[PDB]
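Tutorial sheet, problem 5. The two components below are modelled jointly, 73 residues in total.
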Amino acid sequence: YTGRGMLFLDLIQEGNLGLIRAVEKFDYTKGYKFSTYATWWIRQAITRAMADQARTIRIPVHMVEVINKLARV
DNA sequence: TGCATCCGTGAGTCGAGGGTAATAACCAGGGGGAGATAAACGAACGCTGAACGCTCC
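Model answer (structure tokens):
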């Protein structure tokens, strides 16, 4: 997700918040590796922050998901 | 102590002119302001004439 109005190092720090979230909600009772669980939370934190901090005029999160959806189609 | 290196600064004058890119995507819940219907008063009207006077027989 580099090169979209957010600095590359800034993306790492916001994703880093997602990682600390994931460890508090992870356990061995599920028969799966930590890597599969973590990547969901990493992607969530990065994409939400990108929605909330890239544009000069802030756009609400649900308008942002509308425009990128229509752009791709 | 001398020699080598790099970093910062400055480099004319007025004229002419405007727009830039890219990636899991959702229920689920739920709060919070922005637009839709009955109650408190007093002011137009309303007939209520009643109650006063203004001319007339």
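Marking note: The radius of gyration of chain A is 14 Å. Full credit if you identified this.
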